[PDB]
Symmetry: D2
Subunit: 268 residues, 4 copies
């Protein structure tokens, strides 16, 4: 019971318990939402991970690059939530960019095939998911994707930043479509969260200079953030996602909410 009581919400993007989407799922359940989860490749893993969620939630396979998965998606969700029931919320918390598109690999050296896959999973799939799910969403519904502010270039994030810029653009178009359904579409631009991958890149997985730069990035983020930024705490971002899934931001779409400690509003 609470912020999302009675809402049926699909949450994609759980892969581990430090997945941003894990915390989104957890908070949404604490707030009364009934979840359907989608998981990409390692469903056994994901099932075991989501066992620790406050409540049980059906898990559906969704490889966002798999047209059949997307084509079957709404029927599978309807099976999961019961005929005559629709989704009130959809959470896109998916992103990927091949290593060549990031870190120390020179920006110019990322082969387009890699970039394109990154943009497919990280940006285009936002529209894919909305296409699959809008038919089974209620008026007053909410689609939320995860963004990392790409409005300025930065070290290491390279083509993933490009992918986020594309995602932000996609979101504005998804909002136009979603609006026909009485549905809002918005992004949450989060501060840096020490996910496994972020920890790995800080630890030098994508090159020492990239690691050093990302560390400087996270330090400066907390410094700039008027209320600070705790990269080890995804809860403030999960809460923000939940804010958008709720009825409490009913006049916002095609938009980006910055759950980044206010870092983006401050130069130094």
């Amino acid at each position: 019971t609470g912020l999302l009581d009675g809402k049926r919400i699909l949450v994609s993007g759980i892969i581990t318990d430090s997945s941003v989407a894990f915390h989104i799922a957890r908070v949404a359940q604490e707030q009364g939402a009934q979840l359907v989860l989608t998981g990409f490749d390692r469903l056994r893993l994901i099932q075991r991970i989501t066992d620790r969620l406050p409540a049980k939630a059906p898990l559906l396979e969704l490889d966002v690059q798999n047209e059949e998965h997307l084509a079957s998606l709404a029927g599978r969700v309807t099976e999961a939530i019961g005929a005559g029931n629709k989704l009130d919320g959809v959470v896109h918390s998916i992103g990927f960019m091949p290593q060549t598109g990031m870190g120390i690999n020179p920006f110019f050296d990322a082969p387009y095939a890699d970039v394109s896959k990154g943009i497919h999973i990280s940006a285009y799939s936002y529209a894919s998911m909305a296409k699959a799910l809008l038919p089974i969403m209620n008026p007053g519904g909410s689609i939320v994707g995860m963004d990392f502010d790409p409005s300025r270039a930065m070290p290491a994030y390279n083509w993933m930043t490009v992918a986020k810029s594309a995602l932000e653009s996609v979101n504005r178009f998804v909002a136009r479509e979603a609006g026909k359904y009485g549905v809002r579409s918005n992004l949450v631009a989060a501060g840096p969260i020490r996910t496994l991958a972020m920890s790995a890149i800080v630890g030098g997985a994508l090159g020492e200079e990239a690691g050093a730069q990302i560390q400087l990035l996270e330090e400066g983020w907390d410094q700039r953030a008027p209320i600070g930024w705790n990269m080890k705490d995804a809860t403030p971002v999960a809460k923000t996602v939940c804010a958008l899934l709720s009825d409490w931001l009913p006049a916002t779409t095609g938009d980006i909410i910055y759950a980044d400690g206010g870092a983006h509003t401050q130069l130094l």
Copy 2:
């Protein structure tokens, strides 16, 4: 009970029952907040107006241009809410620009004395209010001001748009100060709301061409808005203000939330 249960929130800016702040007050009370109101010049009027709020709320005079009012403000609020109690939220819903700074009066013809008064009440007072009230705000608190997106120029709004640009700048600095207190500071950029004044300007009070332009503005807003925009309904904006007053946007400050139907994210 609900979104704001237990929160003590000061709401400025009620002058009539069509004041944006009236609806902010109403929704906040429906959501469990305990209010203190401030009212500017016509306290008898404002008291009679706020009698229709779901709950009684002490009303304090606050002329934001009156240094003594601001100097006494926190003690008066403490009297009203009880010693040992602090505010959790502050709503700045105040704005004013002399007629010369708006409408058909040529932009170049607004005397600086008029502009300055407009900027005093509409922008600087955001910092004034934060200065007066941050000492009596709890950690986790929230200050929210009302904004109208000034990022592009527009007909008729003239120097009030300039004042909003200044307000947005002020908010970013107020966030820096507020952050020391564990307090967030944010603006809600609302779509156009058919307040008495907006109705009056549509009806030609500031010149026929200004009226015509503002009418075109509100029509285009609803057209652009992916979810539409109902200028006769301040509830979606009151709800958004409440979202920011709540614990559900805990990593956003110095920021602007657009409760405008998504109009600003769409060109045409």
Copy 3:
């Protein structure tokens, strides 16, 4: 002689005499630049078109999706301009999005393969071109790409707008690379220009509703533009491109100059 006197500048993107790049080429030559042109598929056509340029300019084939073309590009340019000579400027005036990614074809119905090709040619190729050409660019050099402001969604332009958002992101990264060479990288966001394709879409080639919307778009652009916008005149944009190719914007990179009549700075 003039603004670009002595500069050696590669201009991509001429396909017809109404190509934005044709006018960029023409103005650059009027201003003293020595050009190398690249042309994509119809070289005989392009040669015949560029015969009308004020001066002769070597034409090199460049299919931006062809890795060999890009791999050979700098040597071919060096052959064309003479060993020991480098480029001072590069103009990316290339864009393409399959029909499915635009117009009346539902946004959700653009297959990723189409989108990806669009993003390849329209966004990624900006980095491709910079990768190929930075080794043969002089310090103080300038790379300029053509942008159409994607900061808000719009009818009909659909995935091309997404591609522009990606391009703007790419440009910011290209600037980081280009900076190592003493080279600036910038976009020109032009107003709508009645190119063959734009005329075709206005005339209904991508659906009547798309045509109607684009017509409304161009009308509103001129209305919003404080100095007007003449979609039949690419000269103000060619001049702006030339401004960026010149030494007169020497502290601007990763940036976007808006040659749009000021339309983007105005709401209504």
Copy 4:
């Protein structure tokens, strides 16, 4: 002779030889412009300073807060340039904020009277100057003001940043007016320039912490700037101002050109 040959251009804001406007004046003269200068309080000083300009230029007193100065301004300029001659360019390079509005003085402690004076001189005067001078400007003319990117808050700059936000807003409205005259209005957002005042604040004139912060600000600016930023060199900014005064940015108004080394396009 050159970029501005034959143009008659009013350049305000020279106070010393390290004034940004001194370099704007110098470059404009090197480029063929005929100047009229305006100077604020110390005309003897300013005359002696501008004696070192490449060419002689009439100097007119203009206190932008003095309505009579502004009321007489266009006739005095016409006297200076000759009846039947008009201005082609106007440079607003004026700014001021009382000490209370900056540095270590708490943001909340700047009395509105101080802020208002700051906003008067730094923002409103942009409109004042355009009002005074548009009647005596040629079609194809250009008004340029000096901006410091206020889109994010920063240490020390406090209410001057607010003033710049207001200036940027004013510029968008001035463009609407200027457009009626065939005149463009634009800002140049410069990187930090080690003007006397900036040197003084770095040296602790407005508090040690403000000095330290501004020093960090200038260091980070050069680091972020893809082409670097040399705060001791106003020439790249003078050149940019000249770019806008020229015919080479003929489709840009109400706009801001960033002569900041690209720093604003980069996060880290």
